[PDB]
Amino acid sequence: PIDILIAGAGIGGLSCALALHQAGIGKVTLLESSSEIRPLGVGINIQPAAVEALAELGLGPALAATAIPTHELRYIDQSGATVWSEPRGVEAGNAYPQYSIHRGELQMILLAAVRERLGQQAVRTGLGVERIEERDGRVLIGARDGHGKPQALGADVLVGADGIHSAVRAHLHPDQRPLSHGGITMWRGVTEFDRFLDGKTMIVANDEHWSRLVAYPISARHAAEGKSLVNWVCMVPSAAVGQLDNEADWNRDGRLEDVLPFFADWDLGWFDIRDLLTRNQLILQYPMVDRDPLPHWGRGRITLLGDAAHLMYPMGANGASQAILDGIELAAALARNADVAAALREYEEARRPTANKIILANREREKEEWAAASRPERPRL
Ligand SMILES: Cc1cc2nc3c(=O)[nH]c(=O)nc-3n(C[C@H](O)[C@H](O)[C@H](O)COP(=O)(O)OP(=O)(O)OC[C@H]3O[C@@H](n4cnc5c(N)ncnc54)[C@H](O)[C@@H]3O)c2cc1C
């Protein structure tokens, strides 16, 4: 079997390893820069199609044991009344549910499955990819550990699933644009609720100043007791905030005093936003960034997957869901083609056009909303 190396043991890398194993493709090894894989991050949404992929991978039970099968999305106005609502998951006509889950819990589920099926030697932590070369009919990787010691590795295929600050992507597209700021500043976290609607309904709201709120339960364990762990995201035009940090970080702590002022005049009645924010278990800050669409992803025996390939704003079905589906397609492409390079190109041309359309459309919608909100839903206070 061909030797496959995946840079990054995040949602995309781990799910990809599982998809390759499912297809009976090669001997897989993952290199993770972090010293240890931790259940970091807050809530995310896995779309039904991505949930179906995970279920076919045998993770159905695991997901049902920790995630919430969100069945409705309610858009409420500044008086707290429902303006629009729609079903989600199975009730919306999908074969599988949409799962709202803690990203960390998802990573642990994937990690557990990888160690179980691939072996406990399969994931090498504390090793960050630093240099890459395609030579001698293989890809030669230069990594470095926490002590600064060099580690050389070789593979027949290199999958760049190294996220937002992908080293593999930088290698393939050295003259690429730095991250593109979407013009929105994000704060997110989780807050425990004695009760939150039926424990499986997502809430969305925004004011005339284009400050947005999205809240939804993500813990099946909490629900087991009639309680709910409510994930929340506040989105405000960056023009109102100024610069948060020097670089985008998925695990950067935020401050209540930075976000609360934008929602301090809100009074949704039945739903207390001051309570939601004030009682948070944690607050994380992040600039809504993405990357310009690329004309091509890979080269030779190297390809990209997940955020390393198509970083998107963290909303809707962007992110995890797309990374998961990339993995399934990559494994299928490698199983269908005898030549490694051709397999990678087929995978890319099957997923890149899709990704690029989402990126461009997301940008246009955000731009349109900003333009509309800028010309002369009022927070009740
Ligand atoms: C700690 C953390 C917390 C997150 N929290 C959220 C969240 O709350 N909400 C949300 O929507 N998204 C979050 N994300 C991002 C989310 O996981 C992804 O957008 C999506 O799931 C697609 O996953 P991915 O594998 O492409 O990227 P990621 O999940 O970001 O995984 C990339 C992995 O590659 C590794 N890596 C990076 N560079 C190198 C290198 N040079 N060598 C080796 N490994 C490298 C990282 O350490 C990481 O484990 C978080 C990511 C991380 C790493």
First to last CA, the chain: 65
- E strand spans, the chain: 3-7, 27-32, 43-46, 68-70, 72-76, 82-87, 98-102, 123-125, 127-135, 138-145, 150-155, 157-160, 180-193, 201-206, 212-217, 228-237, 282-290, 302-304
Annotated binding-site residues for FAD read 11-12, 32-33, 40-42, 103, 129, 188, 307
The Cα 218–Cα 227 span in angstroms is 11
The Cα 335–Cα 222 span in angstroms is 41
Return the exposure string of 163-189: e unless at least 16 CB atoms fall within 10 Å of the residue's CB, then b.
Answer: bbbbbbbebbbeeeeebeebbbbbbbb
Please report the atom of ligand 1 found closest to the CA of residue 305: 26
Cβ atoms 184, 366 nearer than 8 A: yes
Please report the atom of ligand 1 found closest to the CA of residue 130: 41
Ligand 1 neighbour 163 (Cβ under 6 A): yes
The neighbour count for residue 232, using CB atoms within 10 Å, is 21
Q: How was this structure determined?
A: X-ray
The neighbour count for residue 278, using CB atoms within 10 Å, is 11
Cα 11 to averaged position of ligand 1 atoms, centre (Å): 7
Residue nearest to atom 11 of ligand 1 (CA): 314
Tokens describing residue 135: 């030579």
Within 8 A by CB and 6+ apart from 148, the residues are: none
Cα 90 to averaged position of ligand 1 atoms, centre (Å): 28
- Determine the residue of 15, 106, 162 to mutate for testing ligand 1's pocket, defined as the one with the most ligand atoms within 8 A of the Cβ atom: 162
Cα 251 to averaged position of ligand 1 atoms, centre (Å): 10
Ligand 1 neighbour 231 (Cβ under 6 A): no
Structural domains of the chain in order of their starting residue, each with its CATH number: 1-36+118-177+292-363 (3.50.50.60), 37-117+178-291+364-381 (3.30.9.30)
Among 244, 241, 237, CA closest to 284: 244
Alpha helix (H) residue ranges in 230-317: 238-241, 256-263, 273-278, 307-310
Contacts for 205-208: CB closer than 8 Å, 24+ residues apart:
205/75, 205/76, 205/77, 205/78, 205/268, 206/377, 207/78, 207/266, 207/377, 207/378, 207/379, 208/373, 208/377, 208/378, 208/379
Residue nearest to atom 49 of ligand 1 (CA): 10
Distances (CA, A) of 343 to 121, 167, 295: 26, 22, 18
Distances (CA, A) of 18 to 58, 108, 130, 167, 348: 10, 13, 25, 22, 19
CA atoms within 13 A on the CB side of 269: 8
Ligand 1 neighbour 34 (Cβ under 6 A): yes
Please report the atom of ligand 1 found closest to the CA of residue 307: 26
The four Cα atoms 224, 254, 287, 356 give a dihedral, to 10 degrees, of -20
Cα 10 to averaged position of ligand 1 atoms, centre (Å): 5
Owner of token pair 């992507």: 169
Interior angle at CA 117, CA 111 and CA 123, nearest 5: 45
Resolution (Å) of this entry: 1.9
Ligand 1 neighbour 105 (Cβ under 6 A): no
- Determine the residue of 30, 51, 103 to mutate for testing ligand 1's pocket, defined as the one with the most ligand atoms within 8 A of the Cβ atom: 103
Please report the atom of ligand 1 found closest to the CA of residue 306: 26
Kindly tell me the burial class for residue 144, based on how many C-beta atoms sit within 10 Å of its own C-beta (0-12, 13-18, 19 or more). middle
The Cα 289–Cα 314 span in angstroms is 9
Among 135, 170, 173, CA closest to 152: 135
Please report the atom of ligand 1 found closest to the CA of residue 15: 25
